[PDB]
Amino acid sequence: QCPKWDGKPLTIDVSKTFAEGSKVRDFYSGNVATVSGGKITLQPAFGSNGLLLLERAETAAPAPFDWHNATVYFVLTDRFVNGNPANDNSYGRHKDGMQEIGTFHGGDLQGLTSKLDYLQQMGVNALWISSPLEQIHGWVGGGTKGDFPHYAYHGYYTQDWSKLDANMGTEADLRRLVDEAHKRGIRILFDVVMNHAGYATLADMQEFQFGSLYLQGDELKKTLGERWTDWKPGAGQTWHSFNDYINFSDKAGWEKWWGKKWIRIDIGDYDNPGYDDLTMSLAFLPDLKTESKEISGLPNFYSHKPDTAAKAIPGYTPRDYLTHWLSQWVRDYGIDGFRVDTAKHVEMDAWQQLKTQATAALAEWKKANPDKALDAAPFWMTGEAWGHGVMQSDYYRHGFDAMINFDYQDQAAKAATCMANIDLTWQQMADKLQSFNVLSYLSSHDTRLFREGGATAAELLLLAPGAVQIFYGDESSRPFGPTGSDPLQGTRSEMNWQDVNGKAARSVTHWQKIGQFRARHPAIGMGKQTTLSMSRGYGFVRESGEDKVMVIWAGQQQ
Ligand SMILES: OC[C@H]1O[C@H](O[C@H]2[C@H](O)[C@@H](O)[C@@H](O[C@H]3[C@H](O)[C@@H](O)[C@@H](O[C@H]4[C@H](O)[C@@H](O)[C@@H](O)O[C@@H]4CO)O[C@@H]3CO)O[C@@H]2CO)[C@H](O)[C@@H](O)[C@@H]1O
Ligand SMILES: [Ca+2]
Ligand SMILES: [Ca+2]
User: Fold this and answer.
1) Which domain holds residue 509?
2) Alpha helices, DSSP H only, in 433-548?
């Protein structure tokens, strides 16, 4: 079912690719061969699976960065490294004492900063982090059954875009991360949401005095207690049960939250969610009125939120505030781009505005910090549109430099046991991505962990045309963790650092060599592909202007 390999050296025909008498390096082994009769002979080093990464021996350093050859490392900051354990319990947040499925584990920006050398060793040149912005303080019911408390550990339940989340760290912590990353040629990307704000939690209701309960006086104190968030589900109750105590009819009480002008939600005297992608409510999340031309003022509950950096601005719509608040971080810190969540659930004008502003903001920060600035490159924005494939969609005309490619995960699944089965996908992609760019992944928090490969995931992802997204732990086969009654939760398991420094050391070393080779050769990401014809194993060359690389896979050893 797959090309085979005797295990002996390979004699490769390089006639058309490399020059006569020129030296060629297998980057994986360090072995150098001279061309004579348009031919070279090399043994794939042990632990290579029969890989040769063939380059001109001239090659000495990484190539100048291009987004079309980018290696993005996507990290859920909470589930990576806990640098500072003091911030793990911000806003009264608690571990669940069970399997920690949907709690803050305590991973933070400081801890992420401590591992930038590790990321650089993999040839990572862009770091995409979960939103570090202030989330909802409390929890909701986790999964269909409500078997775990679900906190905003993933950065998708935003409360205040103008502030950092205390669990992630301080303005100092974020500045150190961005500056240490930029010193290592690693761009910073923020996960950004504009579609929705987080659910109503007991912690936020109590702190910012919005919504209504059915419980009054001392019956309230008996049930919820001093801090309503400390409530545990009782006998014949699930973590969803607390919603039985919340009066979602109270018009005057729920207006004290975002306000009728800010969100569509099926609550009190608010405009109910629409029927189309733009105005519908995803999973009963408050849908932000991004299309509204109505001057909104600030969210009503920001009245009881003195720590906010949000200020009322004349003529400003909810959209204007959101693009403003997100742009501020770019101007202040030099954030190189955004990964945009739920791109299909927000009108295109909103995304264009965000891009215009974020682009101006990055240009400003680079002007004002020319020693720190990597280069004069514009702000990069990529989008999540569910089911988006390899296609120059309308998104590319309204401020997106690349959309996330959903199709590569399942295409690469058909090549898990056999690397050569990807060739038809790579030919298609290398050709179409001469005119535009996408961000392809094997694993995501929304889909599954690509583990059916083993260490072959390294070559499937890192040799793919266009930008590639390593999901944290891809390099270490981070196992799908406990998930309860939500099937996706296990995709966000803790980073398996014990395996990185143990049984998965071989795999990480493999990822490091491929990723470094990718960082040296824009042809991988950008080049036209010529698949070679050999009775001895699978192979291709990629050439893009200056750069030229040949990648040979010998096959299955036995
Ligand atoms: O905070 C604002 C919202 O508050 C109220 O919604 C509650 C619900 O009462 C809870 O049930 C829970 O929602 C869960 C839900 O139990 C679970 O089934 C799933 O929801 C599905 C839904 O069944 C399905 O029909 C479709 O719409 O997809 C949904 C998402 O998969 O997941 C939900 C959350 O994980 O929590 C919320 C928040 O406390 C109130 O009724 C809402 O009107 C309001 O917007
Ligand atoms: Ca921490
Ligand atoms: Ca919407």
Assistant:
1) 69-139+148-188+308-329+384-518
2) 457-462, 497-500, 505-520, 522-526
What are the Cα distances from residue 156, in Å, to 300, 343, 540?
21, 13, 40
How many angstroms does the Cα of residue 482 sit away from the middle of ligand 1? 22
Ligand nearest to the CA of 136: 1
Q: Kindly state whether residues 509 and 534 are assigned to the same domain.
A: no
Q: Provide the sign of the torsion angle of the four alpha carbons 417, 418, 419, 424, taken in this order.
A: negative
Q: Which two tokens stand for residue 125?
A: 């040149």
Which resolution, in Å, applies to this structure?
Answer: 2.7
Method: X-ray
Strand 467-471 relative to strand 71-75: parallel, antiparallel, unpaired?
parallel
The CB density around residue 387, as the number of other CB atoms within 10 Å, is: 7
Residue 106 known to bind ligand = yes
Alpha-carbon gap, residue 186 to 72, rounded angstroms:
9
Cα three-residue angle 492-496-498, rounded to 5 degrees: 165
CB contact at 8 A, 511 and 47: no
Q: State whether 52 and 158 are in the same domain.
A: no
Residues 311, 162: Cα–Cα separation, whole Å: 9
- Determine if residue 53 is labeled as part of a ligand binding site: no
Residue 157 CA: which ligand is closest?
1
- Please indicate, yes or no, whether residues 25 and 160 belong to a single structural domain of this protein: no
**Which H helix or E strand runs over 190?**
strand 187-192
Residue type, 497: W
C-alpha neighbours within 13 Å on the C-beta side of residue 359: 12
104 exposure class (CB count in 10 Å sphere: 0-12, 13-18, 19+): buried
Among positive and negative, which fits the CA dihedral 196, 135, 239, 246? negative
Collapsing DSSP to helix, strand or coil, 196 comes out as: strand
Contact residues of ligand 1, CB 6 A cut-off: 140-141, 144, 199-200, 240, 243, 248, 265-267, 283-284
Q: Which one-letter DSSP state was computed for residue 137?
A: S
Task: Please tell me whether residues 46 and 83 are part of one structural domain.
Answer: no
Which residues 6+ apart lie within 8 Å of 440 measured at CB?
405, 408, 429, 461, 464, 466, 467, 468, 469
Angle between helices 171-183 and 318-333 (to 10 degrees): 60
